[PDB]
Amino acid sequence: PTAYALAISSLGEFNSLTGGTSTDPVAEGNDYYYRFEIRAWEGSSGPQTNVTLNVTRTLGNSTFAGSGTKGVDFEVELDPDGPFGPASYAPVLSADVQVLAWGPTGVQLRYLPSLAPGATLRFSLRANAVNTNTTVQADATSTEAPGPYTVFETTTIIP
Amino acid sequence: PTAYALAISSLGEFNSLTGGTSTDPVAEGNDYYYRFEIRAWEGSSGPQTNVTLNVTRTLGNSTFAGSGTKGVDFEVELDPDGPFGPASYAPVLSADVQVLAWGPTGVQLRYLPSLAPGATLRFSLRANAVNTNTTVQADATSTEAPGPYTVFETTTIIP
Ligand SMILES: [Ca+2]
Ligand SMILES: [Ca+2]
Ligand SMILES: [Ca+2]
Ligand SMILES: [Ca+2]
Incomplete structure (x- = not known):
């Protein structure tokens, strides 16, 4: 059913979109990246469709970067x-991701292909450190799954 | 000042206290582990004292495991x-950690030694998957730092 x-x-x-090393705190006026995973249950009755990540700024003044x-x-x-x-993480084709919205806040x-049971997606998001703590809410959903699934990540920004 | x-x-x-691989979702009746980092700013005016992690269950029915x-x-x-x-992550001496509280909920x-600017601590916590989503709030503080610093992590539990 579910x-x-x-x-x-x-x-x-x-401190990098892929590879590099961990950061936080971040000095104001520097780039940094959030990473989030969406993971399909290995027991799922088939592949999942419309796997969507929604990230929103809940506290502080940092902004998602670029266009x-x-x-x-x-x-x-x-x-x-x-x-x-x-198998390792590899970037998908540009054709396989729709930007539903891109704003500083x-x-x-949305991942356009269907997501195999057991498979995982890794989303990296560039942000501008601006002073104080930034926290973002990340919501994951699909068509077939009883979403949303929600986390909050927090970054200390040095003035 | 701050x-x-x-x-x-x-x-x-x-799926392991150290090493192993990632999990989530987790099937009810299996162990899993949360990992959280507390990170000292490289610019801090000296080492930090009484670095404390407070983790609490906010939703669902999973429990921190053992005694x-x-x-x-x-x-x-x-x-x-x-x-x-x-330098890599290495477990500290038993003498260097105080269990302030250990309960299923x-x-x-608390880390007893002082934490050098730039240094990081990794905390792994065993839990019992019990069905639905479990979310825990993790708070980090020290004597010298304007804490707390708060995240929420969420685990989908298969019935
Ligand atoms: Ca793999
Ligand atoms: Ca963080
Ligand atoms: Ca190191
Ligand atoms: Ca999770």
Whole structure:
């Protein structure tokens, strides 16, 4: 019925869209990136459709950066077998992500392909550190899954 | 004045206290682990004292597991140079952590040594998956830093 499940997780902040290392705190006037995962339950009755991430600023003054360019302002990677297999994260084709909304205070991304049971998506989002704490709410949903699934991640910004 | 800063991040869920791989969703009747980082600002005016993590269940029915045994129910690791140097995470001595509280609905850990500017602590916490979504609030504080710093992590539990 429900018979499909999804999960969301925060991975915290990084100083690069992909690779690099962790950050937080962040000095005002520097870029940083939030990373979030959406994970399809390995037991799901088939692939999931319209897998959507909605991120919104709830506290503080940092802003999502740029105009919404894939490979600079955001990245979406697929781990095709999730934690259950040795395949790694690789960026999807530009064709496979729709920017529903890109603004300094809110970003919405939808994955157009269907998401295999067990597979995971990694979303990286560029932000402008502006002083104090920034917190964002991340919501994950799909058509088939009883969403939303919600986390809050928080970044300390040095004035 | 303030002149010291701290940060907190969620790292999401894992199927092992250390190492292993990521999980979430989690099937009811299985163990899983939350990981959280507390990070000292590299610019802090000296080391920080009484670095404390307070984690509380806000939604759902999963519980922190066991009686509070270091190396089974929780782990605390130090990365002595944080992301700024090549030293890795290593578990601290049992003497260096006080269990302020350990209950199925709330856990409190304090790091007794002082935390060098730039250094980070990684806290892993065992939980019992019980069906629906579980969310925990994690608060980080120190004596010198304008805390608390708060995140929320959420786990989907399969009935
Ligand atoms: Ca999660
Ligand atoms: Ca994989
Ligand atoms: Ca953070
Ligand atoms: Ca290090």
